[PDB]
Design a protein around this ligand. Structure first.
Ligand SMILES: CC(=O)N[C@H]1[C@@H](OP(=O)(O)OP(=O)(O)OC[C@H]2O[C@@H](n3ccc(=O)[nH]c3=O)[C@H](O)[C@@H]2O)O[C@H](CO)[C@H](O)[C@@H]1O
Length: 370
């Protein structure tokens, strides 16, 4: 009944792990949110036991990653956890080494997208991918189970003999609060009298930001549409567009936001031209808002979006095709509503966060008493 949730980022605890954690709290367990300090740490402390720690998130310096993870082992050791849920690569691998060195008996892993080491193909990145995969064989072997939020990541990692089918659990998506993300109780943000083409994302190039801005250029307000981008960029990051790029195109830039339901209600459709995903949550949120989606035909996107059912798929790294799919929906309002209505019907039946959370807890029940 002492259950930790380790992440590299408090965003993942607050946005993804939370419904699991709430369900365990409501059952009378002690739930720990273990993540570096961030914008959500203080409110999370009110609900759960916040634990912070230092991390060079993107660094691959060996002695930095040894020291980071040794300190981490001590922080985890002092919590006296019965089970630790990790998520994403650094916590799955090094969080597991540190968890076992700290004497934690049960470690559950979680893969939610394979990330940029499978987008890039430069030799340096092909070597990094090899090492991480070889480390994963050890870390998975030490952990008791791994949850996958899509099928392609599980299939892939099984095919590389990184983990036995026995330990793979497929829980599709991290779920969405369909009662909060409900159009009937949501008041739209006012963005004018325009057909809003909404993209929600951290401004990673690997998220398709450039293609989205190029497509805005191509359509240039066709049928009174307006491209709108929600999310943060960063300065001096090669992996990221800066605010000067995000403010300099035919896109209305809103920066970070907390009224996503309200923004989705004001939108005509949601675009996600990502290069690679796990099970994109902005897609789930758009679906719960009964909004059609236009998404790249890539990993993750093509499991959350079924072409012709709840959205349309476009080629990746292709602004013209992205624009083309958007124009088809701008040209055909009845189709766009039908797809969004199917999107709503699907989230409600398969992706509500409450049933998703219950299925994580059944995995834990195999190992500890809940
Ligand atoms: C591999 C990858 O590229 N992405 C995956 C990764 O996290 P990502 O962080 O890439 O997931 P994402 O970008 O889909 O996260 C979106 C979440 O952030 C929220 N938001 C975003 C912008 C903003 O200004 N305000 C705001 O509140 C939004 O409401 C939603 O809850 O893990 C997720 C959880 O399973 C999904 O699998 C994604 O597919």
């Amino acid at each position: 009944a002492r259950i930790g949730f380790l992440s590299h980022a408090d965003m993942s605890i607050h946005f993804f792990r939370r419904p699991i954690m709430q369900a365990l709290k409501d059952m009378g367990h002690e739930v720990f949110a273990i993540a570096p300090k961030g914008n959500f740490t203080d409110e999370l402390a009110k609900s759960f036991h916040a634990v912070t720690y230092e991390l060079d998130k993107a660094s691959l310096n060996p002695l930095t990653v040894i020291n980071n993870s040794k300190k981490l082992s001590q922080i985890l050791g002092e919590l006296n956890l019965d089970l630790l849920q990790t998520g994403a690569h650094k916590s799955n691998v090094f969080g597991t080494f540190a968890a076992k060195n700290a004497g934690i008996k049960y470690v559950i892993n979680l893969v939610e997208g394979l990330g940029s080491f499978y987008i890039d193909d430069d030799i340096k990145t092909k070597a990094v991918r090899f090492v991480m995969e070889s480390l994963y064989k050890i870390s998975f072997a030490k952990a008791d189970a791994c949850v996958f939020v899509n099928n392609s990541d599980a299939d892939y990692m099984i095919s590389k003999n990184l983990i036995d089918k026995s330990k793979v659990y497929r829980i599709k998506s991290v779920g969405v609060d369909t009662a909060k993300f409900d159009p009937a109780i949501t008041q739209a943000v006012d963005l004018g009298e325009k057909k809003v083409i909404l993209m929600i994302a951290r401004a990673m190039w690997h998220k398709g930001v450039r293609e989205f801005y190029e497509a805005a250029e191509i359509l240039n307000g066709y049928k009174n549409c307006e491209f709108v981008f929600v999310g943060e960029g960063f300065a001096g990051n090669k992996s990221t567009a800066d605010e000067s790029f995000l403010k300099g195109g035919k896109v209305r830039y809103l920066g970070a936001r907390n009224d996503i339901p309200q923004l989705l209600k004001a939108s005509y459709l949601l675009a996600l031209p990502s290069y690679k995903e796990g099970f994109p949550v902005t897609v789930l949120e758009a679906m719960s808002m009964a909004k059609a989606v236009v998404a790249s035909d890539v990993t993750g996107c093509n499991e959350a979006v079924k072409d012709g059912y709840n959205g349309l798929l476009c080629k990746v790294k292709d602004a013209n095709d992205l624009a083309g799919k958007i124009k088809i929906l701008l040209d055909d309002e009845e189709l766009c509503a039908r797809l969004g209505a199917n999107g709503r019907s699907w989230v409600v039946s398969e992706f509500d966060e409450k049933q998703i959370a219950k299925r994580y807890i059944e995995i834990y029940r195999k190992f500890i008493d809940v």
